[PDB]
Amino acid sequence: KPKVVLTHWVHPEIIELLSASADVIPNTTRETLPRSEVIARAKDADALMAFMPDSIDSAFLEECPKLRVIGAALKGYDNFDVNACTRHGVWLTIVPDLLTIPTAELTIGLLLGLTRHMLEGDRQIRSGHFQGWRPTLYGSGLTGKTLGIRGMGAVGRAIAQRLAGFEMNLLYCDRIPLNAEQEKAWHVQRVTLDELLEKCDYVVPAVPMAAETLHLIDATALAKMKTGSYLINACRGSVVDENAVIAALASGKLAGYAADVFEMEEWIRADRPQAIPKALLDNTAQTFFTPHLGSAVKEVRLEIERQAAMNIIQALAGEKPMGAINQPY
Template identity: 35%
Template sequence: MAKPTVFVTRRLPNALLQPLKDAVHLHMWEEELEPVPRETLLEAAAAADGLLTMLSDRIDRALIERAPRLKVVANLAVGFDNIDLAACEERGVIVCNTPDVLTETTADLTFALLMATARRLIEAADYVKNGQWKEWGPYLLAGKDIHHQTIGIFGMGRIGAAVAKRAKGFDMDVIYHNRSRNEKAEKELGARYVGFDELLETADYVVSLLPLTEETRGLFGRAAFKKMKKDAIFINAGRGAVVDEDALYEALVQGEIAAAGLDVFQREPIGKDHPLLKLKQVVALPHIGSASVATRTKMIELCRENLLNVLVRGQSPLTPVTASR
């Protein structure tokens, strides 16, 4: 029986892919920081039985319909809004993601981003590096307390619960909003379920960990920011497109909220001339929520094992988002 063919859309460590290379015909885009061009991806997918993709790769209906052999897409992310799930279901293509292995690392980054924004750490570090620190002052770069404040988490899944656990270590009050109640978080962490409006109006820190869906797209717009406290800080470590960035910029400039910490954006990479990057009260990161060496290694290994299970071992994938017909 002929070996299946797998295409990897970004350069990954050979040592991690070796078990896959031993079992399949593996082809890989050899750039780490440059996405595979669309035409190259379409051509490779047309001859592939499996794809190992990044969140930045658009796996849409047009690609699926040009890939008659495709059986499985292993996405190197917990999210999968880059993939047309309906088209995959129709064609019997299994979609897999990488949940669980990145939960704690992403929660670390989310809380670090909250702390950096609240205590103005990036601004303070630049102040020293730029030679501006001449004297001490009582309110020099004074920020906002974190301890004993209220954190409002929208998206109380695995990562949200892990963020809430960290917040409890700072004696924060935890409120949350979600499509459904998270009774485990309520029982173990003392998190309190509230409506969306109450979360916006009550929280000192509003943290979005939402997936991108038609319901969440642009959810944080002008109306949402106007309901927040004037000294509130907004953190987004979920998906960029849940935020209307023009509305966020306006809210920050008008003083409707105090600051924002952002790891994700509507369009990535964000351009250096984007208005949000001109504001000192914005901490912007290049989508590094799960970017620790250990976690990225586990994510790659999970993608590899999902591909091997489906294409070689005749087994079910470890972390399917969709199942084949």
């Protein structure tokens, strides 16, 4: 039987699925293995399941001569050298985008937890000193307030559909507008980009449709935003200039920052940080952070794992795998 190496943990039913057609070498832990250990395992593997920490270059492939398929549990392939895979006769497969709904829900979670001081709230409970209602930790509510969705991609749409029932004033900007029937059913209003920053108490960058530049929220964008506004970034680490966010928090321009993603995650930028700035880390009163939990919901992780496993099983059986993005031989 062929051997398949899984660089990260998967659900036991994925292992059983793969076990019928292959000998499985799992990662039994929740940790990322060092590259040398992944290679030591994959050196005589016929198949690999790759995750976000994996970096597949030709040096990797030269040390893994039996490899026939890399099934990535990922919707894109930034850290894969796809043509190297093709030249080495290695199928490279991805999965469809299943991150949209759990990312929209978590974004609403970061918004609520940050505006309502829920983390400082929890810390006060755990202190043992709670003695009843007090006039403290007064936050900012949603109803009557104006929230701006920068970009109406699939995530932006999923947020608008969910915030429609909260009796807010919902604005969005995008090069391409929503249909008329969706703007009415979500009570969301199309405006320009400078107007959205200007009127919004809450600014929520999603990925726009179409294209466009890097650091969508820089010092210039922050200066146009309303004083005492909140910025919630569950989109991409490149979207927000964290150091400008530090200065906007210090001067009172920003009331708070919530993020699920960080500039240190962008392995495409050379001008790249190696940690989350400690000024953000220290500011527990005004920040709410999560470690890229956007799609950390069991049912979605399972489905991403199953599609990657199905691609591997297909390729080992001799077929074109459903998620192939190349054609090797």
